[PDB]
Design brief:
part of a larger assembly; 9 chains; A alpha+beta; B alpha+beta; D alpha+beta; G alpha/beta; H little secondary structure; I mainly beta; A: alpha+beta; Dna-directed Rna Polymerase Ii 140kd Polypeptide, Chain: B, domain 3; five-stranded antiparallel β-sheet; 7 helices; globular; G: alpha/beta; 4 helices; 8 strands; flat; binds zinc ion; transcription (chain D); DNA-binding (chain D); transcription regulation (chain D); RNA polymerase II general transcription initiation factor activity (chain D); General transcription factor IIF subunit 2 (chain D)
Chain lengths: 196, 192, 132, 134, 48, 195, 176, 8, 114
């Protein structure tokens, strides 16, 4: 039975979806256990128009597993513990000299400028999580567990692996930004390199 | 796939077109319209070109080479070296300066190739932008002799003054963010 | 030592060597061999040890008094395909007999299990069950 | 002066320390005795415009290790110790980083293969049983 | 059709819904016949 | 084993990496996990390929791919990757030589087989992702030999082009002289024949 | 002079045991860490388990179940989940507070990737002139937290509901 | 199989 | 053009105008640090996006076996005859089939378009 390759980052463009470019990675825990969990990093299209929306234009969002609602990406990076905007961009943008990529990241940074606390970001992820959250403490611990295990398992599942997960998430965003700029070609689903 | 290049247009034919007609779909896959010219416009290719220009949607984004938002506290200061000459000429007999001058500046460069292809005029574009936004936008346009076509846009001088004693600390979008929103709206929906 | 214009013979010699060493169905056989040799044992080992204790039995002082039972599976063993008759006497099962008698071609699966009892009596006993 | 206070005297004295990445065979050779107070000699030779660093394995221990330097300007590193008396202290600031590489190229792969086999010993595999257990 | 130097008599769109909203139901009868004839006769096949 | 070797061969780990240094160095992915970056990619790539061809630390199934434009080295040890064996070309000369086919010809009583050919480095298994980085020659003698220059950097050669066909298509005689749908139909009819 | 051709060679010593364990403290270059202003510092294990692990089971635990009800209460809580984990400080991150509350605060996290095939040693100058090598027990990366006003979580939720903040965000921060 | 205007 | 991050809080600096002095100040929202802006340009958008791909091309691409190589076009910098040549290889490159030559041979790393 043919299947799409796991533990890889694939960027596709979906016309029907509100996201102009969507990058997906299906992660498995070294095939040892657990079902494959897919995390999507998407960029909203500039077609949506508003006084603030047109100014921000394309804004990046992430569909973390087991969280019902889309989470702004800067919030996820803060939830992993990288609070400073410069550090988040250091993980996302490997060379700060290029202006175009930084311009792409700017709107998503503006969207998440309300949240500057790691604990607050974790609480926000838990609150918008599909599973109900009774209190702030419970929501924070639950969202921390989701980030530790459910999201990007192949990079790490335990052992304080937040830095590795942050680097791989930033790699997914970097690839999405490159696809949006046009520097990298969108991946093809039919390629048999992808079809294990 | 197996139409011909004679059509020189995207055409839906075969089973999908049959389904479109049978289902009376509101949105055809390739809506098309065949325009037959009345008189001399049909005979002469140039007149047909004029009709084409009349019938094809054109926005500022199509004819705009690049847009830059600057901060210039004084219009006479002319932070951009190039606009010094025509800004000085316009401000030799300044218009709307009495109200005020907005410090934030939107500078738009229009590609000459696209401008001449659609036969647009700098004065025409200025009039259309002025009409679309009323007096909220003040536009300065270069002469066509200038090698680079430059349009300089600033927020309303009356709006900059606010013409209000209370002045309302709301400060919506300040002026730079408002200028960015104006640029996006102009590029998308100018309909020149 | 280059092979010029003798290539038609040489290419089919190397292809023949490939097909002699690796049959046409080598992918299925190799995958199943990997399953049995490695994946079954790894699945057994990956499973967390079973931890069991009584629910405050006897309502005594209960200073961890309920015993703790720990089970850890190890060292999976497979036997050759075997068919047990109505008499219960094991015997090897040839594939053709499986086809004729509608039997299933299967092999017994055995696991070593280690059971430890911790009753808070200052002594822990780790009995081992071999080839369960 | 409190329990949580960090003794920054090493930082005040600006004590310079060197960080080195060394392989497991060398560390395990050192750990074998680990109590003789001696494991080898570090020899640094400097020229007009080039410096080379090398480490010699002790003759008793064996029964050449060139050092490659790395730039430390991209990240600032310091060393701190947690004393058994709950008195945290700072030893110094890292001013240079180095890596130790093996001299042997191919025969060293033999020792690497032996290490791989040793690490694979705990790996357990399904065992074929000739006779069904009764 | 309103634009100057465009023939109002002969200008036609392929979308039948537009023909209905602009020109009427009889015009759509004829336009639907024309479009169906175009799809049928593109291969050269003939239907009475 | 690949990760251990990569640590030996001057691969700085992501944790120890200064974020600025990533921009100018290639990223090394093993089984889809970004292990680290390497400052000098080509030397590492050659070393990995040498190891695989000698079958020392990297097994034959393991596939190494270098995307030169994107500064990424990807190593896949995953299962389910589909691979085909290809002859290896060094300079413009096939590595397979007359001595190898002489040993293979007397395959009986010489215990020389396809495994010995793989171990010798004459042939290699290449998956599609690595196929994207490989210049192949359909026929060795024709394409390798100097002509009007088309490619002088062939890296692999096809053993025989007729191996692209499957089991049922291989029984068709002169397949290249038929229409393609007809070969497709014969593939289905041959399963239903009587014998 | 002798500096152009100096050759220095020193003995290497590796003591079997040291009273103080050796760790690595790594600061990011962009942080511009400076020790001149470090008059005092406080390094201690974190208490974030207050928020997510312990003393969170304060009120329900000491509510006052007794007798058969006590037995059932304990057993029910234990079997409900898998016994909540408590403080095990040695396996928790480190919090650094330089110059008390006024100065910057940093957080150190143990390097998750273990060095199963690598070891790190530190060479320090000593009066005897011989290098001493000490194994690296742990690696910590410290990142600062700004000593600025932090948005309250409830206020942050309220603001995020108005995701379309047409008004200037800087004024909003000033209001808080 | 013929051309772009023909059949595949 | 470029984004400047504040030293005090390591966050993005957003443009702000001081009415009293009519001076542009890059001020973070989170922290009070304010910096005068030398560039005096807030936002630049190139709709034509006529950006040369010569800068984006990596000198490492010369090592690729699959790339075509011409000895007809000599290198300008060093005179090496061989030069791999390839097209834009870029999405949103509009309609350009220009060949972006890259000189071969170690360490020259010269990229020219003819
Ligand atoms: Zn700041
Ligand atoms: Zn050159």
């Amino acid at each position: 039975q043919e299947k799409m390759a796991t533990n890889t980052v694939y960027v596709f463009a979906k016309k029907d979806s509100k996201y102009a470019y969507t990058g997906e990675c299906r992660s498995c825990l070294e095939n040892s256990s657990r079902p494959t969990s897919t995390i999507w990093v998407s960029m909203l299209a500039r077609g949506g128009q508003g006084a603030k929306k047109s100014a921000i234009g394309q804004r990046i969002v992430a569909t973390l597993p087991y969280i019902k609602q889309e989470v702004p990406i800067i919030i996820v990076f803060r939830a992993l513990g990288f609070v400073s905007d410069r550090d988040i961009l250091e993980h996302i943008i490997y060379d700060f000299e290029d202006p175009e990529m930084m311009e792409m990241v700017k709107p998503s940074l503006d969207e998440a400028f309300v949240i500057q606390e790691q604990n607050v970001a974790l609480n926000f992820i838990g609150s918008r999580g599909a599973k109900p959250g009774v209190t702030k403490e419970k929501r924070i611990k639950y969202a921390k567990e989701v980030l530790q295990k459910e999201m990007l398992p192949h990079v790490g599942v335990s052992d304080f692996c937040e830095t590795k997960k942050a680097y791989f998430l930033g790699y997914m965003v970097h690839r999405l930004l490159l696809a949006a700029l046009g520097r990298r070609e969108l991946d093809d689903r039919d390629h048999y390199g992808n079809k294990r | 796939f197996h139409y011909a290049g004679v059509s020189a247009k995207n055409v839906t034919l075969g089973v999908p077109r049959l389904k479109e007609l049978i289902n009376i779909s509101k949105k055809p896959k390739t809506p098309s319209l065949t325009v037959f010219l009345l008189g001399q416009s049909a005979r002469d290719a140039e007149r047909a070109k004029d009709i084409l220009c009349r019938l094809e949607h054109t926005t500022l984004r199509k004819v705009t080479a690049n847009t830059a938002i600057y901060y210039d506290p004084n219009p006479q200061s002319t932070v951009v070296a190039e606009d010094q000459e025509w800004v000085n000429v316009y401000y030799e007999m300044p218009d709307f300066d009495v109200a005020r001058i907005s410090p934030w500046l939107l500078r738009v460069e229009l590609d000459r190739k696209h401008m001449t292809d659609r036969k647009l005029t700098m004065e025409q574009i200025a009039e259309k932008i002025n009409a679309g936004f009323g007096d909220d936008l003040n536009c300065i346009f270069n002469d066509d002799n200038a090698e680079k076509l430059v349009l300089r846009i600033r927020i309303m001088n009356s709006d900059e003054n606010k013409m209000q004693e209370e002045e309302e600390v709301v400060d919506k979008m300040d002026d730079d963010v408002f200028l960015r929103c104006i640029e996006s709206n102009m590029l998308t929906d100018m309909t020149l | 030592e280059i092979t010029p214009d003798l290539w038609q013979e040489a290419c089919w010699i190397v292809i023949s060597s490939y097909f002699d060493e690796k049959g046409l169905v080598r992918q299925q056989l190799d995958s199943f061999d990997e399953f049995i040799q490695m994946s079954v044992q790894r699945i057994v080992e990956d499973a967390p040890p079973i931890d069991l204790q009584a629910e405050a039995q006897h309502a005594s002082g209960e200073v961890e008094e309920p015993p703790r039972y720990l089970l850890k599976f190890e060292q999976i063993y497979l036997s050759k395909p075997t068919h047990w008759e109505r008499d219960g006497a094991p015997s090897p099962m040839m594939p053709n007999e499986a086809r004729l008698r509608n039997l299933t071609y299967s092999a017994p699966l055995y696991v070593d299990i280690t059971k430890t009892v911790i009753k808070e009596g200052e002594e822990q006993l780790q009995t081992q069950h071999q080839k369960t | 002066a409190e329990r949580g206070e960090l003794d920054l005297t090493g930082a005040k004295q600006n004590t310079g320390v060197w960080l080195v990445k060394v392989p497991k065979y060398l560390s395990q050779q050192w750990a074998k005795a680990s109590g003789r107070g001696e494991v080898g000699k570090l020899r640094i030779a400097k020229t007009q415009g080039r410096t080379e660093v090398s480490f010699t394995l002790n003759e008793d221990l064996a029964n050449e290790h060139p050092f490659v330097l790395q730039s430390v300007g991209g990240q600032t590193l310091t060393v701190f110790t947690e004393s058994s008396s709950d008195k945290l202290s700072l030893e110094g600031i890292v001013v240079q980083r180095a890596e130790c590489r093996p001299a042997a190229s191919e025969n060293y792969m033999r020792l690497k293969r032996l290490q791989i086999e040793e690490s694979s010993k705990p790996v357990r595999l399904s065992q074929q049983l000739d006779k069904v257990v009764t | 059709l309103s634009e100057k130097d465009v023939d109002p008599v002969r200008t036609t769109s392929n979308d039948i819904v537009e023909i209905f909203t602009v020109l009427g139901i009889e015009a759509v009868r004829k336009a639907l016949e024309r479009e169906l004839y175009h799809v049928i006769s593109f291969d050269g096949s003939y239907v009475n | 084993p690949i990760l251990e070797f990569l640590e030996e061969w001057s691969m700085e780990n992501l944790e120890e990496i200064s974020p600025a240094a990533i921009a100018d160095a290639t990223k090394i992915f093993v089984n889809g996990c970004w292990v680290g970056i390497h400052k000098d990619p080509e030397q590492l790539m050659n070393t990995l390929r040498k190891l695989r061809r000698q079958m020392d630390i990297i097994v034959s199934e393991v596939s190494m791919i270098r995307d030169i434009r994107e500064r990424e080295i990807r190593i896949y040890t995953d299962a389910g990757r589909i691979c085909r064996p290809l002859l290896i070309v060094e300079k413009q000369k096939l590595l397979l030589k007359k001595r190898h086919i002489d040993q293979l010809k007397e395959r009986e009583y010489n215990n020389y087989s396809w495994q010995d050919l793989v171990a010798s480095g004459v042939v290699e298994y290449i998956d599609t992702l690595e196929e994207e980085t490989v210049m192949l020659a359909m026929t060795p003698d024709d394409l390798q030999e100097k002509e009007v220059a088309y490619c002088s950097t062939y890296t692999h050669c096809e053993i025989h082009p007729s191996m692209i066909l499957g089991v049922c298509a291989s029984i068709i005689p002169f397949p290249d002289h038929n229409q393609s749908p007809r070969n497709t139909y014969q593939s289905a009819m041959g399963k239903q024949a009587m014998g | 002079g002798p500096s152009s051709q100096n050759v220095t060679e020193y003995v290497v010593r590796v003591p079997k045991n040291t009273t103080k364990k050796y760790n690595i403290m790594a600061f990011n270059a962009a942080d511009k860490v400076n020790f001149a202003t470090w008059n005092q510092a406080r390094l201690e294990r974190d208490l974030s388990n207050k928020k997510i692990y312990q003393e969170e089971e304060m009120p329900e635990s000491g509510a006052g179940s007794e007798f058969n009800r006590k037995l059932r209460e304990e057993a029910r809580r234990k079997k409900y989940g898998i016994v909540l984990k408590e403080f095990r400080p040695e396996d928790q991150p480190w919090l650094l507070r330089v110059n008390g509350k006024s100065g910057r605060k940093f957080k150190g996290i143990k390097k998750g990737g273990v060095t199963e095939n690598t070891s790190y040693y530190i060479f320090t100058q000593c009066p005897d002139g011989a290098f001493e090598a000490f194994p690296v027990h742990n690696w910590y990366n410290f990142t600062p937290l700004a000593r600025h006003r932090t948005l309250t979580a409830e206020e942050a939720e309220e603001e995020w509901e108005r995701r379309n903040k047409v008004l200037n965000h800087f004024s909003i921060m000033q209001q808080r | 199989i013929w051309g772009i205007g023909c059949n595949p | 053009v470029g984004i400047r991050f504040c030293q005090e809080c390591n966050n993005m600096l957003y443009p702000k105008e001081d009415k009293e002095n009519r001076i542009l100040l890059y001020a973070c929202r989170n922290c009070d640090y304010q910096q005068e802006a030398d560039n005096s340009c807030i936002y630049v958008n190139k709709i034509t996006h006529e950006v040369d791909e010569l800068t984006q091309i990596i000198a490492d691409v010369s090592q690729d076996p699959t790339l075509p190589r011409t000895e007809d076009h000599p290198c300008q910098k060093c005179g090496h005859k061989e030069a791999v040549f390839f097209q834009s290889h870029s999405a949103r490159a509009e309609d350009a089939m220009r060949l972006y030559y890259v000189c071969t041979a170690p360490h020259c790393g010269h990229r020219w378009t003819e």
